[PDB]
Amino acid sequence: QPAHLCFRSFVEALKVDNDLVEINTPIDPNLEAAAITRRVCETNDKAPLFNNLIGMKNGLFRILGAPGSLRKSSADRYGRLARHLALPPTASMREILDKMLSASDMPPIPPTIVPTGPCKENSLDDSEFDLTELPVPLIHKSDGGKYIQTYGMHIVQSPDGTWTNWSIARAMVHDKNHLTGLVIPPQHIWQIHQMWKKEGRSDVPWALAFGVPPAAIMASSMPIPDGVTEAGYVGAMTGSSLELVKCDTNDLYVPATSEIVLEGTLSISETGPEGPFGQMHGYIFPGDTHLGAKYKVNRITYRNNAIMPMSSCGRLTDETHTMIGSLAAAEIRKLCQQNDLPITDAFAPFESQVTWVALRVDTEKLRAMKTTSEGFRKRVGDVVFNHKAGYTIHRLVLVGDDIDVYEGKDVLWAFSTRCRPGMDETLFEDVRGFPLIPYMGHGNGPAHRGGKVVSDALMPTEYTTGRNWEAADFNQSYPEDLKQKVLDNWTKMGFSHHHH
Amino acid sequence: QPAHLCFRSFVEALKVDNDLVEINTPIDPNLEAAAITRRVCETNDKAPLFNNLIGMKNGLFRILGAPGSLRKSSADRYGRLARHLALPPTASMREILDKMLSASDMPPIPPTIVPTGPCKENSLDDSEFDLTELPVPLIHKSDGGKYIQTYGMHIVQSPDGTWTNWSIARAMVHDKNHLTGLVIPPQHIWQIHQMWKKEGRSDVPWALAFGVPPAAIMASSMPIPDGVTEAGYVGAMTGSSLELVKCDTNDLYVPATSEIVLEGTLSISETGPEGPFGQMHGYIFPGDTHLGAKYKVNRITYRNNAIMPMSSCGRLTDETHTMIGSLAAAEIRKLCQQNDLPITDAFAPFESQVTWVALRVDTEKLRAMKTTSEGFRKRVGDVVFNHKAGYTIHRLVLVGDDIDVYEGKDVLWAFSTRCRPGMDETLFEDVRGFPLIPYMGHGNGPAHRGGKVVSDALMPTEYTTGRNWEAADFNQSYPEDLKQKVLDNWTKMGFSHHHH
């Protein structure tokens, strides 16, 4: 089975890529696995596969850390992401995001139901498992629980059956048969949960699948539109119908090659303690526990020699940056284009802790609009910040055509030199804010509202007659023939490879 | 003569450091020397010494590029700066800035007049030189003139004789015997020029010395206080009186080992076309020529085999960043401390194009002040932005004790995660602005006023009870014994030197 359609095959791809380290000696899930993984993430090392995890019983479980983190080399920097999508490992960010947006004007390819799959190789009923006895990792020393769920896919369906949503949301072990987790607006898991609550008849049928097809975990991390079933979108993007099996205890369908599947319910009435968790902005607030959603687990099914993917998230760079940020940015690009705004490219700079998105403007189109900064800033921010795709993003940086938004140094250059503080900015206080950013939920103002800004790093002539500068750099401040001479004579003169 | 007291010795130090490339084949001063130097600056390579410059006549001149730029290695990153000051080449930025601030509470050590020096080895009177015939570089392709003066020291004295100022300010060749250059408020060259203009009796006696003692060019780049003679300050910092010789045509005194000295006058009445010049923010605005100050050159004196230092300035990283930014930041640190503000450290992040300064706060002292963000922001910004040392700086970022302000990635982390846009900021519109930033002089508002901000990246409990988070990183989210195990087993497990 191809790597993008089967997690087990993905793992093998990473091996073949010389991008895996298999650790076959005992590793403690209490902090050690996550510490190793954190180090990998801070240094762009190879992904760790823990094949000998202290506490693994009856095949539950091995761990793969850093499944969507960065490689060291520039030439295959995003290679692990490319492997989730059948792309060459040298694929650019633009090519990855274009792949993820490609199904947005294609017909969905609905999934295919099959009678069984690897995810049925083993099962544990209500009398045979205990979630407190599994080798669930403690990821950060101050976490409020053992976070089993950092890279699985929650599966919930609208009461009417018409929309089945796949998404990632964190969850931790509460007791032998329950999790607690984040279910917050405007996320689709929350939107669906609200529909069940309003109906008031039953708890929400639920499954959580770990080690799902890599192309599915990437759509899981992406804010595709409301009411769109991720399975169909993945099918369209990959050109193939996903093979799903029915759960044993409910009528939901899980990917046939899922490593591990939990089946049960998301309560419409109960909560339990959840968090804190060391998260995407880089922080843990020890003791900041709050009531979260509560899931009941009725049944576990799993592959032989099951592997649990884990994100040891926090400071740069991990899946919370590479996937959350980039995929939001992709959707924001599309949203802007659909609103007739002249945006060519969007990216969340890692340097911003994925709280900014830089928007590359087609300034020939902008010129034709005959507008102003004030007007244009307002229009862009109203589009993006009133939409779910803008939820995580607190600063939009508008930049002209000379800036590569996929290069943080060039975004910082433009921001610092072209956007006058105050005058070239519009503040948005009456928009939904992202509370998990420290300056929001642990800050000076309302946790859930405002704190957003559009920073205009377009120069004034970009609205009127065209760019009126050249950069004072090697590329722009010297003619071609000279530059090439300089390069050709560089090592001859005594000064100091793409792949590395 | 020691490297910090004699430019020729500095050049030799760079050789011995294996931090020089001597180019003995013909190099064109029309763009080629500057292009090579620009490439060095963008890649942190070795400094270039052009010993064979097309157009050099009668010993005028060789060029040394990138005299204060960065080295490739982390361990001696600031080694060229350290060599200007007799510091070890592994010196930290904090150690360099502390050295530059060290003379601020010491008695000045006034200079010593000597009867001659190397700078008198050769001379050209009013009938023997022509500045248009020298090998003055064209530094960027769109510059408005050939910028002879990018790393020399202007020497002007108050009418009353009490203050002799040393500073760097750009200047370009106007004609055979004149330069034009920037003389702008609040710079000391401008302050002195104004005193002469108000007296109205004569043009300002002037000299411009190139290849001066490296400890003197660093004070030249630093905004020490009004009325303080740089020579005395350099003397105190170095522990030795500087040896100066009298000019031939006026009563000013130049460093005895100056490579090249121009003597003449700065006009109190004439101007001429000046600029554009590819500058510290990274931009040139082709055609943006404005009237500048005009200097008349009466006499040139020079060393045998004279060497002209040159800054090929623009995008990161060159002397405009490493010296302008850092030295301003140093003076801002002191200023804050003298105003009873609990600032421990200041640095201008290169990522900001040296338009920001990050201010590290002693939060135990802050707590004792029993204040608020709003109040504290106002107080800091009133100090800094009403002072000359704050002139170039448009954003102040306040950060707590966990942040190393000398590390741009940590400043960006804190800014992006701890400062709520709008609410955690105070805008300053009634302060002097720095017009050379593009968003000022080529922007939407007044070129000379406002555009400044204090961004408070202190969290709320830093004002009250103490930091209430841990970072979700390897350093803070795992106990010591585990971290050390992980490190000790890193290469055993199969994962991947300070000097590299």
Ligand SMILES: Cc1cc2c3c(c1C)C(C)(C)C[C@@H](CCc1ccccc1)N3c1c(nc(O)[nH]c1=O)N2C[C@H](O)[C@H](O)[C@H](O)COP(=O)(O)O
């Ligand atoms: C890739 C990844 C994604 C998330 C999350 C994680 C990872 C690795 C962690 C490791 C589990 C951390 C945590 C970050 C939390 C976060 C909250 C809200 C938005 C973004 C991030 N997490 C989400 C979490 N979302 C929460 O609501 N809830 C979560 O707990 N996300 C992001 C979430 O998958 C994306 O926003 C999707 O667009 C949601 O899908 P949806 O559009 O609602 O169908």
Ligand SMILES: Cc1cc2c3c(c1C)C(C)(C)C[C@@H](CCc1ccccc1)N3c1c(nc(O)[nH]c1=O)N2C[C@H](O)[C@H](O)[C@H](O)COP(=O)(O)O
């Ligand atoms: C290290 C360096 C320093 C400057 C300058 C340059 C270099 C390499 C360039 C290459 C010549 C570029 C140019 C940058 C311009 C600039 C203007 C005003 C402030 C900062 C920079 N330049 C200055 C220029 N200042 C101008 O007024 N005038 C100038 O032309 N500076 C900075 C200037 O030396 C410092 O502000 C000093 O504090 C001035 O000394 P002072 O306190 O007035 O005794």
Ligand SMILES: [K+]
């Ligand atoms: K999704």
Ligand SMILES: [K+]
């Ligand atoms: K702007």
Ligand SMILES: [K+]
């Ligand atoms: K000075």
Ligand SMILES: [K+]
């Ligand atoms: K703050």
Ligand SMILES: [Mn+2]
């Ligand atoms: Mn969805």
Ligand SMILES: [Mn+2]
């Ligand atoms: Mn001065």
